[PDB]
Amino acid sequence: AMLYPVLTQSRLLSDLSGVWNFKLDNGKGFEEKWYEKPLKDADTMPVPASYNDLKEGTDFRDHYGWVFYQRNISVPEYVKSQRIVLRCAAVTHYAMIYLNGKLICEHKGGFLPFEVELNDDLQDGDNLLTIAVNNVIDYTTLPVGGKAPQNNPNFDFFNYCGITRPVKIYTTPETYINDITVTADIDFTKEEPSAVLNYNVEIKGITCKVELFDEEGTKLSETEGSEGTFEISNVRLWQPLNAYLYKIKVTAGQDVYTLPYGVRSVRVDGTKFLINEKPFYFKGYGKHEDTFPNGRGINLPMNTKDISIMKWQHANSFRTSHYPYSEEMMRLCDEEGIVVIDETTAVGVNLQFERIGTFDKEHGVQTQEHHKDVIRDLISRDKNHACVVMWSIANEPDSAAEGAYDYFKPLYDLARELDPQKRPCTLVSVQGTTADTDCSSQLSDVICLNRYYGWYFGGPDLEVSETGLRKELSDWGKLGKPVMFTEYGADTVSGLHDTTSVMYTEEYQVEYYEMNNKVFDEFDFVVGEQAWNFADFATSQSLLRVQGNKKGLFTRDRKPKMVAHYFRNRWSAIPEFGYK
Amino acid sequence: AMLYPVLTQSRLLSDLSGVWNFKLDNGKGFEEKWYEKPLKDADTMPVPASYNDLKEGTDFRDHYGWVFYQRNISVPEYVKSQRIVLRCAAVTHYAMIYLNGKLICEHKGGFLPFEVELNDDLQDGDNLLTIAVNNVIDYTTLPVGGKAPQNNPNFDFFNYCGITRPVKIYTTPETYINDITVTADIDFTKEEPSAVLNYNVEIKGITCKVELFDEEGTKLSETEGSEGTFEISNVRLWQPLNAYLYKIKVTAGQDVYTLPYGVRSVRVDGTKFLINEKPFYFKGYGKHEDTFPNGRGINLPMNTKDISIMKWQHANSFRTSHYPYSEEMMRLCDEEGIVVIDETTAVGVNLQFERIGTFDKEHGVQTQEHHKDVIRDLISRDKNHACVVMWSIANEPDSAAEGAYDYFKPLYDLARELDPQKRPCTLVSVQGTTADTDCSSQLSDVICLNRYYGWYFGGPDLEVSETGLRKELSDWGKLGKPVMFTEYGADTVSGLHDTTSVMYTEEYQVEYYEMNNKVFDEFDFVVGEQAWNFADFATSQSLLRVQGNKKGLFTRDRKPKMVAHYFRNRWSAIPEFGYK
Numbered sequence A, B: 001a002m003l004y005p006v007l008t009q010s011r012l013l014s015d016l017s018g019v020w021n022f023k024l025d026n027g028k029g030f031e032e033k034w035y036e037k038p039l040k041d042a043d044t045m046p047v048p049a050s051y052n053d054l055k056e057g058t059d060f061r062d063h064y065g066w067v068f069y070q071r072n073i074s075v076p077e078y079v080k081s082q083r084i085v086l087r088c089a090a091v092t093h094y095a096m097i098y099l100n101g102k103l104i105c106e107h108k109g110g111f112l113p114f115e116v117e118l119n120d121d122l123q124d125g126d127n128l129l130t131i132a133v134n135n136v137i138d139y140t141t142l143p144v145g146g147k148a149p150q151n152n153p154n155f156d157f158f159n160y161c162g163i164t165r166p167v168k169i170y171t172t173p174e175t176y177i178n179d180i181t182v183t184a185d186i187d188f189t190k191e192e193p194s195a196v197l198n199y200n201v202e203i204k205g206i207t208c209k210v211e212l213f214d215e216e217g218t219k220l221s222e223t224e225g226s227e228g229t230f231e232i233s234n235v236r237l238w239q240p241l242n243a244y245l246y247k248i249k250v251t252a253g254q255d256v257y258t259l260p261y262g263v264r265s266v267r268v269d270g271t272k273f274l275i276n277e278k279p280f281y282f283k284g285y286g287k288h289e290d291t292f293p294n295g296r297g298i299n300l301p302m303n304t305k306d307i308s309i310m311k312w313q314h315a316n317s318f319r320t321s322h323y324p325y326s327e328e329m330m331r332l333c334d335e336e337g338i339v340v341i342d343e344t345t346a347v348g349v350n351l352q353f354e355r356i357g358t359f360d361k362e363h364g365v366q367t368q369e370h371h372k373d374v375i376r377d378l379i380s381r382d383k384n385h386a387c388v389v390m391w392s393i394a395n396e397p398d399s400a401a402e403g404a405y406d407y408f409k410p411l412y413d414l415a416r417e418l419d420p421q422k423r424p425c426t427l428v429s430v431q432g433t434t435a436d437t438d439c440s441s442q443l444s445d446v447i448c449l450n451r452y453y454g455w456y457f458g459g460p461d462l463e464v465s466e467t468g469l470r471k472e473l474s475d476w477g478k479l480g481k482p483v484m485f486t487e488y489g490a491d492t493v494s495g496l497h498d499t500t501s502v503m504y505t506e507e508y509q510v511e512y513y514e515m516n517n518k519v520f521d522e523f524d525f526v527v528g529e530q531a532w533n534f535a536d537f538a539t540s541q542s543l544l545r546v547q548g549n550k551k552g553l554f555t556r557d558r559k560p561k562m563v564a565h566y567f568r569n570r571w572s573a574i575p576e577f578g579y580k
Ligand SMILES: CNc1nc2sc3c(N4CCN([C@@H]5O[C@H](C(=O)O)[C@@H](O)[C@H](O)[C@H]5O)CC4)nnnc3c2c2c1CCCC2
Pocket: A155, A156, A157, A395, A396, A430, A431, A450, A456, A457, A458, A487, A532, A549, A551
């Protein structure tokens, strides 16, 4: 369980972000005890941020192995009173915290938070904090390092690493709040729908009371109970592009924490994805925590810029593509009313492109245990987010291979059981699968395709490509379930133009999406269009990557390609609800 | 034999270029007799020029089959006196001339001239000229159409077709000059070298006398003899970047034709490519008759612009890449002193990339007969060009396959025997061959490689790529022959920049050439560096082509990439002669 550190009367918060000392491991790093003494001949390195692009030459950009972040720490003795904790929101890949020279914590997983307490190794005076980060990826990591001394991603984005998100120090009373959970039942029956919310607070280390406020701070109800309930008639339902967030003050044993919460219902019904009992239609794109020169590092300004562009463009949703995003971005979609598809680090679980099969148990992937710890850690983190309407177990696994069904079912189950809101589960299907062959047809509530008819398939022949896409999508309808496209797009170099289009031209990109959009619009069970990608992003080099991935509607610096004006006009004529 | 039509006291010249009528064959074209009546519902189409890009939509750009050019013709009766001839300098692929409705000529081969006489079907009044052009390419065409209703080039440029070069009407006395030939012997021994030129005139249908002038029109010697000789002491030797052209007036039977000619010697000696008994070093690039929206159409202005840029850049040579260039460009290099490697249409003679082998005689290529007619027609056309120092039988054939040696030897032989100057012969070797495996090691006077260490091989690892290129080039030296690189380069999108380079960036392109150029400079038997390509050009669409081929040093409109300034600085510090 991981609550978002905030400033409360009961808890303090001090950011450690800034320029830290930094050294690339030379192999002999751990041998000598760098985590013991202050790094020598060190380099400077802002935190929070990916370090790959922040220096010059390939030696930083393409480093294999470990790096050492190092910074000094010092708390006021008058604080030992309360509990001292170190929250690392995300260290890409493996983290190893040393204080004063001793290991204190260790973590696997580059995109989710982890904490460690400091009360009993926090010395007096100036303490030597050391965070060593490893970037190696393999068949035991999610995301999955392939075989082709260098990391070779089995995924189409660059392997940005370092202290990707912030490192803070918060405190707490000795017995504290540790995990608040809230769910809602809404009775749309009444012409003025109302709702009953179920609280479930948890403490560790006494009386606990719950206060419920409205948008403006107006209190409206109170109760006591580490597992009580609450009633709200004439309830302001959170809605896509129309967020309403209540707030919640849990006072419990000299400790109080506040939580926003939006009241809405998610439910699949036949070929309809329903939000607050209405037939939604996804409009938006798959995104990437990718900016220059931050790498995958957190970027509050671009977060707001990205959401400003989405509203300008008349979109309503995005998918945390290939990894969970920052907590800040998740809260922002709550405030702004952005429907989010929250997705795990499970990309590259596919060895298809003697031959080893993906789910061979001696020579194939070794990810299921960690895949489970991710599903749990992620749902623990974002369970209370009204923006989250669905979960994505994995992006493009070899889901039509043998071993496939056996791999994923234990993970779907774990997901369906750990979501206090029992939200729809899916996985994003790669090109090649079909209704009959895809283990997703059974395990998933929503069929999410990534199809590229007009690019990989059939490009530059958009007629032949249309025939293919009708044929395949037609078949997908026989499952009687909601199907949305989570990726489709074409690599386009901003600036390349032509009257009779050729591939890579802004005109070819617009035509591609006209064909796909025409076919989408023929099937009432298509409940979503999400283009890949929102914006150009960095990938590993290869002959097929024109200085990265150029499938964005926008450039890496958020300037619109012609296609961005095509979608803005199309999405403006398509409602959040009732499109079918 | 084909003399360049010019204006002489004995012969007239009238260009037919302009906007002709034009219709795409619909299949039923030949059935109905379009070549008989005036085209109906016709379109407009400039000649000379490739027609693919001159209209909108894929229907022109990607047409499979025949098109019909049609224009009216009318000569003044007072001309029937003399012989009337129609010279088509180049109709891409197959040509079929109809006059008044009757076929008069037929041709195969899209890049060389062919004529037909008109005296006895040239009616009085207005005659209906019709030129039908076919664009289909196959295992019987040079260049070679692959299997992958559409043409699929087995070569990396777009299949531009139509009346690529001009169509004129010249006349002649009844007995006329038909082919002048001149060769030279130079006695560098004397401190003031002199030379003896051997004339060899030919007539068809009488006295013939030869006049010899100098640059400014000063006569200097005369003689009589359809096979006489001539003497020139203190001779002005044509030289790279220092052209001196004498002129030659052949008066013979009321017919006179003038010819420029430059005196120079070409001779290989060990690992030295010698021009006028000096160790030359090729500096330049492989080019393409490719401009917008002309297609492969002739372009006198860009010809002069291209040659202006070459002198600005301190280059000395270029290769007629994948097909003979226009006669105008050939004469221009004579005037301007550009060393040219004249090359045939023989590209795509390679099926490597049950499996058919290139030179299978039932299922592989069927090009050798035509390949021979090309070698003869080409040498007949350009034999007297001082700029031509070498012949290229084919670009990147599967020269290390079985059948290879048997295919090419008859063609090398035919070439070595038909060049009145016995000039060096070669063929350009694809990536994969080695000294031991390449039938070129024996048949060729100069080893011409196309290597891509840093792109296809090894990119983005320029270290590994350097190790490979040293290893391979080292081996090539064991043949004790001159080796030059006729292609090397990297696809670069003008405008993409970075401090730590990634592929496709102008910086990566400059680094690529620094590595290759460093290694080249280690081997005294490397006698040439020619980059691919001079300028960005159109190709068929595919995932590996960013709106065409972007390996130019210049953009398709002749603007320099950063790499163009790298070469200009490097080539300025490297002499035409004595570099080794
Ligand atoms: C019709 N038959 C084909 N089907 C396919 S599928 C495929 C392929 N994947 C697709 C799916 N993406 C997904 O989409 C995005 C993207 O690719 O840009 C990624 O950014 C994103 O992270 C990822 O989720 C990951 C990788 N990569 N390369 N080639 C192909 C290919 C090809 C063909 C025909 C031959 C040429 C290649």
